[PDB]
Recombination activating gene 2 (Danio rerio), 351 residues
Amino acid sequence: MSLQPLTAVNCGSLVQPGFSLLDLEGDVYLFGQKGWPKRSCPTGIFGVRIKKGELKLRAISFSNNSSYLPPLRCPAIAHFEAQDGKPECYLIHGGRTPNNELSSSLYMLSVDSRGCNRKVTLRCEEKELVGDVPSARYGHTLSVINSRGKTACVLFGGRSYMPPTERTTQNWNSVVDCPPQVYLIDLEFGCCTAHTLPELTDGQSFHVALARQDCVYFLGGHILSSDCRPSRLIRLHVELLLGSPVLTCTILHEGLTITSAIASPIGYHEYIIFGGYQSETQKRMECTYVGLDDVGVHMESREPPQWTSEISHSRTWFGGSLGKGTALVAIPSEGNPTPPEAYHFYQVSFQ
DNA sequence: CTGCAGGGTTTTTGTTCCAGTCTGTAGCACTGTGTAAGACAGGCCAGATC
């Protein structure tokens, strides 16, 4: 549990407050960037390598048969693990276009070929959704479930702009919580079903969701109706049978009151919740550990690495998970003139 | 009584010019608001591979 300060020697203006780190086939891919794609990298997706403290970003190129993606700012990432037939899949939906809009299309990202010389080619495919499509939204969560024995996805939460009739050019950039119904999405085909939640009378956003063996556990998430960050934990159980995807749910008494947490996998099913926001002013410093079994969540606080004064007094912080019990965090910086590197970077490692 | 023409009448309203005295615009050369990164082509080297 130690933190190494990294230097973003070159290309430190591409990272932004909200962004994604996709961990597939070893190396990690940064996804999301300030502004539209520049010709230095006509795709939008960078490869990340951390070596000797240096943070190095390399350009990635798509394949011939793949469509292209706008740099979605705060999308919902779901890691579809290796199985038949195309590992390793990432389901992205749906985020915020850098031209400020909401995109309701689902993307599937995968790896294609290599190298020749340390080069990875990717491929993205839009996945048409016949629905009953969930309204465009950002900050929601998607999670993959395997049940007897087929694969589906559960989509829940998030915010969206005011309904299309009531949005006034004065309440334009206003945003309210989308209604609380769970959407079951088949990977293929695009049949997406909507189901109501008798126990959940409100939606939320920025809640870390952990899915294990056809069970989904939703940690706390910020509610904008009452401005409360509920400590309750939410469990739901998807039993996929022909032909009605019945869904049940229950409440757990206690869980961590946390929003926008960096959920880094370490063990087989053991995660560390790395921290985030517990109140609108104070940020979570304590690192927590969450083991997931069919009995339930087992939660222990672990010794948080000693933070330098800068990251302890910072107003806000964000980041993502580089995997293998390692995570990346960023702190915005001040000065005069421009640093110009607006973000100092730290790499935290476990064990 | 009226009508209109055309007489005089005063009082504007302005009529010529040269000393001035004063007021308002023209001529001079020049101002300031244009204020950042990104695309592209070539050289090359380092690490991967047979």
